[PDB]
Amino acid sequence: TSLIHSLIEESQNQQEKNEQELLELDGDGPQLLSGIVQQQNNLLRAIEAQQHLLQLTVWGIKQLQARILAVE
Amino acid sequence: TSLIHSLIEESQNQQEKNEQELLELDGDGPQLLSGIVQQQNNLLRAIEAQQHLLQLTVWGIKQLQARILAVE
Amino acid sequence: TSLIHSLIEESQNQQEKNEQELLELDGDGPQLLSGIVQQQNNLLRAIEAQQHLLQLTVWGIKQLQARILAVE
Numbered sequence: 101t102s103l104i105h106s107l108i109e110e111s112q113n114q115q116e117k118n119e120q121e122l123l124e125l126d127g128d129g130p131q132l133l134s135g136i137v138q139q140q141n142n143l144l145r146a147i148e149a150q151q152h153l154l155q156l157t158v159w160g161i162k163q164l165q166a167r168i169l170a171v172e
Numbered sequence: 173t174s175l176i177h178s179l180i181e182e183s184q185n186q187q188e189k190n191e192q193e194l195l196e197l198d199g200d201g202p203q204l205l206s207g208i209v210q211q212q213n214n215l216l217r218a219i220e221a222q223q224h225l226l227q228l229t230v231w232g233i234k235q236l237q238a239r240i241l242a243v244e
Numbered sequence: 245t246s247l248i249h250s251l252i253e254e255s256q257n258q259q260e261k262n263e264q265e266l267l268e269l270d271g272d273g274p275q276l277l278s279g280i281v282q283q284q285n286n287l288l289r290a291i292e293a294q295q296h297l298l299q300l301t302v303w304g305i306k307q308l309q310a311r312i313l314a315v316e
């Protein structure tokens with residue numbers, strides 16, 4: 101939730117900067133760089149999707165505690 | 173659920189591609205890249221591990237929201 | 245160390261390897277690589293922060309379950 105979106109905001113922008121630098125370095129170094137940014141993109145996309153799953157559970161318990169508080 | 177698995181599968185696929193391409197430059201060249209690849213290999217295994225742990229905490233939201241109907 | 249923290253620990257130990265490799269090879273490679281070394285640490289930090297939220301939800305579920313089981 102909250103902190104994860106702020107760390108996403110910083111990390112995504114820095115990953116997009118590495119993709120920008122790849123689109124300015126198109127063979128100016130190892131071909132691996134077009135695979136490294138693409139790996140970091142796929143790793144980032146897992147964190148970006150976890151932002152919803154690790155929100156469903158987290159707001160899950162913050163709703164469920166208020167249902168328990170109707171009888172506790 | 174089906175989405176996070178696709179992102180993990182794609183990150184696993186692209187890690188297998190990145191490690192294979194690192195093997196293709198057999199010896200010297202960038203050097204530094206032999207640490208970059210192994211970072212994302214460890215990040216991939218760590219993202220896998222918390223995506224496995226995700227299921228157990230998701231099953232606990234399912235268990236809680238079901239058994240709250242036995243509290244009253 | 246659970247499962248999770250061993251991969252994060254070996255990733256963390258790899259950042260010290262990748263930073264000393266970047267400090268040694270500071271005058272060779274694509275400029276992209278000096279942004280990757282920092283951005284993959286922001287990915288590690290996001291994985292660790294998400295792991296701390298996985299700890300918070302699975303703790304949360306036990307604290308909710310202790311209250312649900314006192315009335316069910």
Ligand SMILES: COc1ccc(-c2ccc(CN(C(=O)c3cc(C(=O)O)c(C(=O)O)cc3C(=O)O)[C@H]3CCCc4ccccc43)cc2)cc1
Pocket residue numbers: 101102103104158159161162165300304307308
């Ligand atoms: C009685 O049972 C429980 C009550 C509350 C919680 C619970 C769950 C998660 C959080 C974490 N959290 C939230 O989930 C959160 C809490 C609130 C709120 O309670 O005021 C709000 C809000 O209502 O705006 C928004 C968030 C969020 O991140 O989306 C924030 C606030 C604390 C600092 C922090 C650090 C890193 C990431 C997130 C968080 C805390 C307690 C668990 C069991």
